[PDB]
């Protein structure tokens, strides 16, 4: 039967995204087809078990021959395209606050289950018309240039243990990008990424980050830059928002604020759930 | 019974040539 309607939605990176509608019932699901060349299925399938309103509902993971079909709820847009559409006006700060609040909710849930995203970027965050935003694309990498701008420094320095703090770093970068309408650290290589971080937050030392000089890719020949004023880096963000961001961007992953602790930050205490200012 | 979208995957597989 040709009782459904399947249509290409676009994109690249990992795969092609499709929109399927059930004509008789009206039901709609999204599909992502991604080619291969079993560790991926294990990590991708765990998201069927993680049910949270700020995590995309993964309906199934289907391994057929040399392809992988991901079936999930159909959300209308991703945060990167919404940021582009909002570039002229900016996203209203109540909406930025709500989105950040909701994303910290989803990461708190993930991190309480000792589940990490590890590859957070705006392209992985989906929004609907009712004001919700959801984490998506867990584990897809298991099946680098694009992900670089949001990578925590301990990863760039070759650390082998990824804590939950790597997701908080990435979200901090997305927070700054929503506020300023420009990526915070747009590196074109691993070393350019590190140096862009160093020039803004100061070149890290053993005082601010115990153990940093013993990481695999640390080099004493790193140039020594001084810390910059956050009021210059994310204007015109308010003092509360700046306090939160700086705790999200501590160098030492143990000092970086947790998702739970961040939810209690004074920045969030007038948070609401407004609908998107655009037709998104 | 399987979900309705089993046919949608069948259709994409068919038209991926
Ligand atoms: C349930 C259903 O409709 N499956 C199905 C099978 C085959 C095709 N098309 C081709 O094989 C070309 C569509 C749907
Ligand atoms: N094809």
Residue numbers in the entry:
A (entry chain A): 1 to 37, 45 to 150, 161 to 297
B (entry chain B): 1 to 17
Question: Could you pull the original sentences from the published paper?
Answer:
To target disease-causing proteins that are inaccessible to small-molecule or antibody therapies, we are exploring the use of a nature-inspired drug modality that exploits the intrinsically favorable properties of synthetically constrained α-helical polypeptides (Helicons). Here, we report a rapid, high-throughput screening platform utilizing phage display that enables an unbiased mapping of the α-helical interactome of a given protein without any prior knowledge of its structure or known binding partners. Analysis of 14 high-resolution crystal structures of Helicon–protein complexes across six different protein domains reveals a range of binding modes, all of which are “side-on”, i.e., mediated exclusively by Helicon side-chains rather than involving main chain amide interactions. Biochemical and structural experiments demonstrate diverse functional impacts by the Helicons which bind these sites, including inhibition of protein–protein interactions, inhibition of enzymatic activity, induced conformational rearrangement, and induced dimerization.
Whereas the ATP-binding pockets of CDK2 and CDK1 are highly similar, their surfaces share significantly less sequence identity, allowing the possibility that Helicons that engage the CDK2 surface may be capable of differentiating between the two family members. We solved cocrystal structures of Helicons from each of these clusters, FP19711 from Cluster C51 and FP24322 from C52, revealing two allosteric binding sites with respect to the ATP pocket. A FP19711-CDK2 costructure indicated that the N-terminal and C-terminal-most peptide residues are not directly involved in the CDK2 interaction. We also confirmed biochemically that FP19711 does not compete with ATP, and could still bind to CDK2 in the presence of other ATP-competitive CDK2-binding proteins. Consistent with the selectivity observed in the phage screen, the FP19711 binding site is found at a region on the CDK2 surface where there is high divergence from CDK1. These results highlight the utility of exploiting surface binding to achieve selectivity between closely related proteins when selectivity is difficult to achieve with small-molecule ligands.
